Amino acid sequence: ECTPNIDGPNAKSVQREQSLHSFHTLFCRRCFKYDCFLHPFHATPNTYNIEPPENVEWSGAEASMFRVLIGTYYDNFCAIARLIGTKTCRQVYEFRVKESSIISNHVYNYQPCDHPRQPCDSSCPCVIAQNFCEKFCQCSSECQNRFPGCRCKAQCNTKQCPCYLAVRECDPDLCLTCGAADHWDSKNVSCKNCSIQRGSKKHLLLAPSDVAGWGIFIKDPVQKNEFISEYCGEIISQDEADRRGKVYDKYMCSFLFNLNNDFVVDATRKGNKIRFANHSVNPNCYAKVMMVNGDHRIGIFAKRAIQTGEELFFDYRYSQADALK
């Protein structure tokens, strides 16, 4: 179901909804981008007297314009006139009226408590799965399965913050005490559990190993439980990883990383520098999984303080059957 340009000649006047079929079915609120990669979504819209008239013609799809502007506007008087540059409030009033007259505790991934007939209940996916509800529930706002947000002055980084004590990050909209919310673009902050989202990764460096193949060295120093970078990659199924893991263990070269019982990360084909992290059992870094705006990302954190030039590692948490890599 398509309806061509409002800009161009073919201006087939259609219903308000039809003029936002695409925009309501493509866009991703979770992503804030149109057709996001990590946002697969195939769901149809469940639901969100005396004087004479003026003898001028309503252009095709100016119909559709003024039709969909009707709901959002809630009866605008002169605003709609400001927008559509060549229609009068009087003609607009007349047309509004005329057209009205013509009328095994495994880890899972997030989806909200999407429930019209109840708040987040026994039917809530996050309640059955022991997950927390994000800023996208179709429950009420007083859904107890929601998350409150922290109230620490500056440092949301120790057990004293719930957002750190719980395995997550300070979502800016739920945490204003900390400065997580503060800064549209600026990264000068004191909430030290807001780096992932902003992506304040370190200036890492690539050079040959002293263990196995390649390795990755940090330039400027760090301190313990400081953020280093994220271990990005493609995120795929488990069975897909079984398949790929066959050959990647035939190579004896993996880049796989268990996100949750539902999904896997693979940076074999694409990812970021950190995937050149070598292995040891006494590392100087380590890992965590973290839900962040309702997505499992992966954080890397310094197991100890480090100076310039060092090499980075971590516990892969294996049986050690595999050779050093």
Partner: protein, 122 residues
């Protein structure tokens, strides 16, 4: 020894001048832009102007990587303030307004913001 270093993309060697804290690692990779663009054209239940505006907005979003709600109320303004020239070169007033309206479904913005942006254009 604090020893020889390489770029990551090319595997050529890294000179020390060019260690140049510039990190060969930015938010907006040079390929993902192009790929999303070429993924737009794959669609069929869609329209020229519509596609174009989607592309441009995606590019903007990838660039400044806005995350939280408030930033969107700022980012529409940012978007016009950057790409108004292009939008005039294409004249996508209708499409752009429609996009803004669609942004006022998920309660990311308010009518004031829309009108404000539109006046920012002209």
């Amino acid at each position: 020894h604090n020893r020889l270093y390489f770029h990551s993309d090319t595997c050529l060697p890294l000179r020390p001048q060019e260690m140049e804290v510039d990190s060969e690692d930015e938010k907006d990779p040079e390929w993902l832009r192009e790929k999303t663009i070429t993924q737009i054209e794959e669609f069929s239940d869609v329209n020229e102007g519509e596609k174009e505006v989607m592309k441009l907005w995606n590019l903007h979003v990838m660039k400044h990587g806005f995350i939280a709600d408030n930033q969107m109320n700022h980012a529409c303004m940012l978007f016009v303030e950057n790409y108004g020239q292009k939008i005039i070169k294409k004249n996508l007033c209708r499409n752009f307004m429609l996009h803004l309206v669609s942004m006022h479904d998920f309660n990311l913005i308010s009518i004031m913001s829309i009108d404000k942006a539109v006046t920012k254009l002209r």
